[PDB]
Design an enzyme around this catalytic site. Structure first.
Site, PDB file in Angstrom:
ATOM      1  N   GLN A 117      -1.969  -7.423   7.822  1.00 55.62           N
ATOM      2  CA  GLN A 117      -3.423  -7.249   8.020  1.00 55.62           C
ATOM      3  C   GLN A 117      -3.930  -8.041   7.506  1.00 55.62           C
ATOM      4  OE1 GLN A 117      -4.314  -5.337  10.620  1.00 55.62           O
ATOM      5  NE2 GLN A 117      -6.375  -6.299   9.749  1.00 55.62           N
ATOM      6  N   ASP A 167       6.994  -2.505   9.842  1.00 55.10           N
ATOM      7  CA  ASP A 167       7.671  -2.229   8.989  1.00 55.10           C
ATOM      8  C   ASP A 167       8.935  -1.684   8.221  1.00 55.10           C
ATOM      9  OD1 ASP A 167       4.545  -2.828   7.422  1.00 55.10           O
ATOM     10  OD2 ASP A 167       4.175  -0.404   7.286  1.00 55.10           O
ATOM     11  N   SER A 205       0.587  -1.306   0.062  1.00 57.92           N
ATOM     12  CA  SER A 205      -0.089   0.250   0.386  1.00 57.92           C
ATOM     13  C   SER A 205       0.543   0.984  -0.586  1.00 57.92           C
ATOM     14  CB  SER A 205      -1.467   0.253   1.630  1.00 57.92           C
ATOM     15  OG  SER A 205      -0.281  -0.255   1.991  1.00 57.92           O
ATOM     16  N   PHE A 238      -9.490   2.137   6.935  1.00 56.93           N
ATOM     17  CA  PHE A 238      -9.404   2.416   6.088  1.00 56.93           C
ATOM     18  C   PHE A 238      -9.630   2.134   4.541  1.00 56.93           C
ATOM     19  CE2 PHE A 238      -6.016   0.457   2.051  1.00 56.93           C
ATOM     20  CZ  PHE A 238      -4.421   1.340   2.488  1.00 56.93           C
TER      21      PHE A 238
HETATM   22  O1  LIG Z   1       1.803  -0.685   8.463  1.00 53.29           O
HETATM   23  C1  LIG Z   1       1.327   0.900   9.118  1.00 53.29           C
HETATM   24  C2  LIG Z   1       1.158   1.124   7.408  1.00 53.29           C
HETATM   25  O2  LIG Z   1      -0.136   0.713   7.277  1.00 53.29           O
HETATM   26  C3  LIG Z   1      -0.719   0.670   6.476  1.00 53.29           C
HETATM   27  N1  LIG Z   1      -2.409   0.331   5.893  1.00 53.29           N
HETATM   28  C4  LIG Z   1      -2.693   0.606   7.384  1.00 53.29           C
HETATM   29  N2  LIG Z   1      -4.101  -0.451   7.218  1.00 53.29           N
HETATM   30  C5  LIG Z   1      -4.169  -0.602   6.188  1.00 53.29           C
HETATM   31  C6  LIG Z   1      -4.227  -1.553   4.770  1.00 53.29           C
HETATM   32  C7  LIG Z   1      -6.106  -2.765   5.605  1.00 53.29           C
HETATM   33  C8  LIG Z   1      -6.786  -1.805   6.459  1.00 53.29           C
HETATM   34  C9  LIG Z   1      -7.616  -2.785   7.072  1.00 53.29           C
HETATM   35  S1  LIG Z   1      -7.744  -3.651   5.460  1.00 53.29           S
HETATM   36  C10 LIG Z   1      -6.300  -3.171   4.837  1.00 53.29           C
HETATM   37  N3  LIG Z   1      -4.516  -2.313   4.420  1.00 53.29           N
HETATM   38  C11 LIG Z   1      -2.958  -2.523   3.896  1.00 53.29           C
HETATM   39  N4  LIG Z   1      -2.399  -0.762   4.534  1.00 53.29           N
HETATM   40  C12 LIG Z   1      -3.054  -0.180   5.585  1.00 53.29           C
HETATM   41  C13 LIG Z   1      -1.158   2.681   6.633  1.00 53.29           C
HETATM   42  O3  LIG Z   1      -0.846   3.776   5.766  1.00 53.29           O
HETATM   43  C14 LIG Z   1       0.557   2.841   7.672  1.00 53.29           C
HETATM   44  O4  LIG Z   1       1.185   4.006   7.204  1.00 53.29           O
END
Ligand SMILES: OC[C@H]1O[C@@H](n2cnc3c(-c4ccsc4)ncnc32)[C@H](O)[C@@H]1O
Ligand SMILES: OC[C@H]1O[C@@H](n2cnc3c(-c4ccsc4)ncnc32)[C@H](O)[C@@H]1O
Ligand SMILES: OC[C@H]1O[C@@H](n2cnc3c(-c4ccsc4)ncnc32)[C@H](O)[C@@H]1O
Ligand SMILES: OC[C@H]1O[C@@H](n2cnc3c(-c4ccsc4)ncnc32)[C@H](O)[C@@H]1O
Ligand code: NA
Ligand code: NA
Lengths: 337, 337
Positions: B185, B270, B21, B129
């Site tokens: 996630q 991350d 993402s 999100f």
């Molecule tokens: O790991 C920290 C980072 O994860 C990012 N993020 C937070 N939820 C998500 C989801 C998701 C959530 C509910 S279903 C899918 N998917 C992809 N990225 C995410 C966020 O932008 C932050 O910068």
């Protein structure tokens, strides 16, 4: 031909002053049901991450919403609250509908407040509110507003910076201004003493039935104790309509305009209050004014955002006639012209 | 003149392609404890309204976070994900840190994804999100990326549009690209079959211990079943450190760098993954690489936002020396500087 020009102009300056929050509403939709999918086990170490399938940003704040609706309906209204330098487009939006924004305090540093809300398919809401510039509303002096635009006919004390709410209410008491106590969300947060401080001497008390019970519980007041402090209680009952109660117990009940959709409940209360007070200012009785308020409320319920509804004489009249009869719809349209 | 030129150059390649993402993180702070005030009785009719006392917007998304960290540490990294036309400043932010953004897909219509998160004083979270442009990541072909930058040493398959995750993983398998399964996630949301499809053949599996148990439960796999599919398991254990496990059961365990504050846990995983994989690309062993990852992880834990930490060799060396000894700190800094 029969208007007294001097006295008409003299009264034209007696506006409704709306105090309360000014915000951007960041609204999202959760494609599920919070009540069903949330379980008690999720509340002991809270870590929730909802996938939302819609996101829109709209103008908001309780005072922004009420001023927008009063302006759209043709009333004379001044918006009195704190916002940030980002407020320019919002200002133009409100001015285009007749709202006097001269007395919006613009913070040198803080952004306009933000309401962040996720609504599920059953209209349940999980939300956070960031005050930002709203906190500076405590630096607004209603005396300066009066000096600039004259004594308003009514000051609405809506949800705001709490200190601003107390200061505004006391300044109304001191300057002899009629005020409407509309504390709404702050009823969940203030103490009983603080709430009593917001209610005493109010021309109007606006709450919904849940908020009414909450107020009575926290203040330690009985209904008679409240009605001794105020001139009129207005209690919305959702789909069951609205009660308007005078101090002697005289009660007027009004049913709702049936909705054609339940899209977003945000701002429905603000809209009811704006429509009711516009009707009262326009010369309508309590029942007819509540009928107008119910129409505006349902129009907000049927749209996403708080100020995204449209005013159309023909459609409004048709829905008012369906709910309340052609005579009532005609009287409402007659005063709004 | 003692270097073997062929093998030296053979090991010199270190390009990481990061898929996942790309987002703006709208982070808010609740000045209390959700546990103090959220109770099972609130589930009947869900209506929550938190006052937050801080709101900041930061660069985010798991792939953005990992690419930022790899770039800051001196690695060679390409960011592969979908964003919106708003991405321009974000692009400049990442390119200024050495990140190749040529293969970011820019949607014609949708905004960059948005993560909206409220964190309380005990690091509990309530978040939503909105994918937006992220869904278009399913239109990115890793074949074009390879044609542009060559065969990378590793492709990180981070949380993303789920279909994009599957397409990227299968394209890695078909093109013979080593990949790291980092579904994070999405482990909460995908089926066991889908997870198994993301794990098969991975060079690395990254999870935390809870996510590991969740993966095993949903896939129906035993630990041995997983280790037969992958070359290395990395399981973070929070304050208990991190396990790095080979298929034959050989285990390297690394403890954590003590934090100076617990500000915000978003993006800590991350950051660990990025630091570990950069260390590995730079030639550090498993233990030293995990020590570097633990440092970067704690730097993110101690700051607001996921990419707001600062990389300074001397402060980094002092903290690494305190946790792991001066020899380890020196070895890490010598390889990265
Ligand atoms: O790991 C920290 C980072 O994860 C990012 N993020 C937070 N939820 C998500 C989801 C998701 C959530 C509910 S279903 C899918 N998917 C992809 N990225 C995410 C966020 O932008 C932050 O910068
Ligand atoms: O009536 C609907 C309008 O209320 C606005 N609002 C939503 N929460 C609040 C709060 C608050 C919440 C927790 S503590 C204080 N305060 C003041 N205004 C609010 C919002 O901007 C929306 O447009
Ligand atoms: N204000 C709150 N609820 C309503 C309804 C309504 C009617 C059936 S369900 C909701 N209708 C009009 N105004 C309303
Ligand atoms: N508290 C929760 N996690 C951590 C970590 C950490 C280490 C590798 S990943 C997260 N490090 C320090 N303190 C922590
Ligand atoms: Na609405
Ligand atoms: Na952080």
């Amino acid at each position: 031909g029969l208007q007294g020009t001097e006295n008409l102009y003299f009264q034209s300056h007696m506006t409704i002053a709306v105090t309360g929050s000014i915000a951007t509403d960041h609204l999202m939709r959760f494609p599920g049901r919070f009540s069903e999918q949330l379980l008690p086990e999720h509340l002991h170490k809270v870590s929730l991450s909802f996938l939302v399938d819609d996101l829109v940003m709209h103008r908001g704040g309780v005072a922004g919403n009420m001023a927008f609706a009063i302006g759209v309906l043709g009333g004379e209204v001044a918006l009195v609250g704190a916002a940030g330098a980002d407020f320019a487009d919002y200002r133009d939006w409100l001015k285009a509908r007749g709202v006097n924004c001269d007395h919006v305090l613009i913070s040198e540093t803080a952004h306009t407040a933000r309401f962040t809300c996720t609504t599920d398919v059953d209209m349940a809401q999980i939300a956070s509110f960031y005050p930002g510039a709203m906190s500076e509303a405590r630096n607004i002096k209603l005396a300066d507003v009066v000096s600039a635009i004259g004594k308003p006919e009514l000051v609405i004390i809506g949800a705001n910076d709490p200190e601003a709410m107390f200061l505004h209410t006391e300044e109304c008491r001191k300057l002899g201004l009629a005020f409407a106590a509309d504390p709404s969300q702050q009823l969940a947060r203030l103490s009983g003493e603080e709430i009593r401080r917001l209610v005493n001497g109010a021309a109007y008390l606006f709450t919904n039935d849940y908020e009414w019970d909450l107020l009575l519980s926290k203040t330690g007041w009985s209904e008679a104790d409240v009605m001794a402090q105020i001139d009129l209680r207005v209690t919305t009952l959702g789909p069951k309509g609205v009660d308007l109660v005078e101090p002697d117990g005289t009660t007027i009940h009004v049913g709702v305009v049936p909705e054609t959709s339940q899209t977003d409940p945000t701002g429905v209360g603000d809209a009811f209050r704006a429509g009711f007070l516009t009707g009262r200012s326009a010369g309508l009785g309590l029942e007819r004014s509540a009928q107008l308020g119910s129409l505006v409320a349902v129009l907000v319920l049927e749209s996403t955002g708080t100020q995204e509804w449209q005013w159309d004489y023909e459609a409004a009249a048709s829905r008012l006639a369906g709910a309340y009869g052609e005579h009532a719809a005609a009287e409402i349209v007659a005063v709004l012209a």
